[PDB]
Assembly symmetry: D2
Amino acid sequence: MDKIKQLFANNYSWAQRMKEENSTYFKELADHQTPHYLWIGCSDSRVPAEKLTNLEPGELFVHRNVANQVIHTDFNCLSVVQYAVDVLKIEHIIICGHTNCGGIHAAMADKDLGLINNWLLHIRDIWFKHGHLLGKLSPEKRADMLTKINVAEQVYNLGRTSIVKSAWERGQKLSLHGWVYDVNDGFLVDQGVMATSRETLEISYRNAIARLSILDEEN
Amino acid sequence: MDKIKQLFANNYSWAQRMKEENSTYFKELADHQTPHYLWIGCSDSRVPAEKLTNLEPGELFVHRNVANQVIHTDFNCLSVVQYAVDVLKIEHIIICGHTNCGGIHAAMADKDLGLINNWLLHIRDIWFKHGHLLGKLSPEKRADMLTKINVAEQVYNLGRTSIVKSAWERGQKLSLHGWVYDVNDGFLVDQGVMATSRETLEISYRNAIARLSIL
Amino acid sequence: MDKIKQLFANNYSWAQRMKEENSTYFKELADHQTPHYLWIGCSDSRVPAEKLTNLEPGELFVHRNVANQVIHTDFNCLSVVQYAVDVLKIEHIIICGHTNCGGIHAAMADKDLGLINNWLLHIRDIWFKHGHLLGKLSPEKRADMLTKINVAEQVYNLGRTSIVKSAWERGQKLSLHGWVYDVNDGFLVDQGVMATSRETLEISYRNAIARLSILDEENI
Amino acid sequence: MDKIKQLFANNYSWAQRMKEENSTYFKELADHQTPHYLWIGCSDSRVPAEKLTNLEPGELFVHRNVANQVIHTDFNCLSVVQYAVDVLKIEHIIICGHTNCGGIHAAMADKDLGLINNWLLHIRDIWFKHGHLLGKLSPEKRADMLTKINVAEQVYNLGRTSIVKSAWERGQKLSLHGWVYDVNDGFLVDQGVMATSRETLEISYRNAIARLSILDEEN
Ligand SMILES: [Zn+2]
Ligand SMILES: [Zn+2]
Ligand SMILES: [Zn+2]
Ligand SMILES: [Zn+2]
């Protein structure tokens, strides 16, 4: 269409600009054949992982689903994880949520959107699991809180997969991370759950939930 | 692993530069609340979609899995599609493959990599479906061709989903595209399958396979 | 292997011992072509459902998975449910668990069994959801308790699917049930959740959970 | 609906004429703590597997889905398979289809039935793969030919899982079976694909398809 044509046009301009600029981008990219980080983010993709981290092209192995989830039985995401860990031997997996997430808003919404609702039912279970902390919070602020709690809960799901547990068990070096960034400042903020073993997973997980449960008198 | 640290050092340096330097990047980003294109790419993510298309930040709804697949029964991908079509009202779903795809290479290698092998079995089925064509090539050239055929097949699976078919049924405007770019120059290349209805899906899909089978 | 040769023998025997009688089992089946109940049970399949309900053959539509679960995002079971509801128009969906369940035991066990642990992590999430309650119970009981709670939580999951909500919402006749029979008794024990609409689902689930939270003598 | 009562009734009686009868059953059934067979059948479930095999109560580990499928990426069925193999040590996995199958008919009809159609696309793919054969066949015969072909294709899929390949690889005993019974007579019939290793799967699978490709006068 109009938009598709425009897109091919931008692509051509860019691609050839590189051609002329004798740009070494693609060659650089070719130097970093194997990625070192598995980035699991949201399909909203407000601020690209490349921009947030300014890493060298090819360093990131990416997976994106609605609301950056790691569901216990999702073959898709688990496939990406097992491949990044057992094959590419990646040592850092990073789950990253973001504020003003459509996935979060849709989950909290009472409208029944169809197939996607089922996928969002996992976020709702997370919402109620922390219903007290959240309810004890002002509406306008809950979204950002569920978004932050979501990340901690997903890092916790990743760390419990048979895949990740076996990696640690057999002495492989692997650390899980969980961050969130505000779509307005672009700053990555650690949510607290950071594991390098099942032990650190449990502790950092309890610790993060405990920290998030300590509310200021601003609600 | 000073990596994570160095990683946060990069983010701070970047977001800091933006603030003090007064960058309306987040201001503009905030303008485009609803995306207009669903991009289904590969987890290898060699050349970011944002770059390949040089689009305005926020315009793309993105899904990435190993080898840019649209498996008939994948709840993950189908959910992204249903939400994007039925909820965000996106009108263009773009499946994009890429040369030198590790996913495609793993599907071809005969080694048990574990869980991921089951995910790649779908690729191996596509390989057999086009075995006559692919059998004429060397392992090397076979990989480049399977990459292109894979994209065509995925577009074909996407257009066969009940989600996309019902969108066309009630008259919603929706087009499917399947492309591939070489990791060496970044030029996006149409593979031939472009649909706006079920009938056009069948026609272009057949024509595309017919065209791809000529050496 | 004799097991397969033997097994095939039984079949021939059964089948022939039917053909000679000019029996009508293969007729009293082609009449009940369309089922009226969707049975969702465990892969353990201790006491068969065709025997627990003594229903005429062909009346059940069945799906079995480890520990009878209805996971929000499981395409397999949601497909069975959707096809049951929207295409077969069946009106009753039963989620029947059973006592002394490997699934439940495996979920509670600390051992890492491989792939299946991931599927069981849903049971373990349920387990912690009711951590306090279950904690108070007596070990030899905890297992059987979770079995019961699990079924409750499964009906609630089923009731929360878009497939069932849209059914009700469009005025289609459909009820959800959740029981737990015992391998010894064989008596189907209703658990409390019996949604017929989303309002029901909420109340019954709410109560069923309240009822199970009231511990008796035995359980410490 | 009194159907639940009328049904709940049959249970109190049947289960009664076992207590007030000291009928072993629950006594014996309990003796078979572990099953030796994994049965993968269609949710239709015309003739139960308990009456088809006439095995001993509790011997079967069962999984049923629409049209008895083993989809490469189905977490549900792969979990049942893996558990039965790596944990229950079952050495026999049987896939059983049946004539006049709803899943097969629905898969062959153009009618978009909703979510289920996505599940059945895997069958339509099998249909296209054997399009020439099935085409040469006769209309009122296609359904049954695809039903047999389907069982063959599923055993193949099952033999190709990493779970099974690995079981074989480490020297575990395991055979795959693919049969189909006619709802009109309950006669179990081997479709030809029987495997005890990756090598027998291949030959057995190729032979079985070759045989089915042979069409008798009555299309
Ligand atoms: Zn988001
Ligand atoms: Zn790739
Ligand atoms: Zn069980
Ligand atoms: Zn069937």
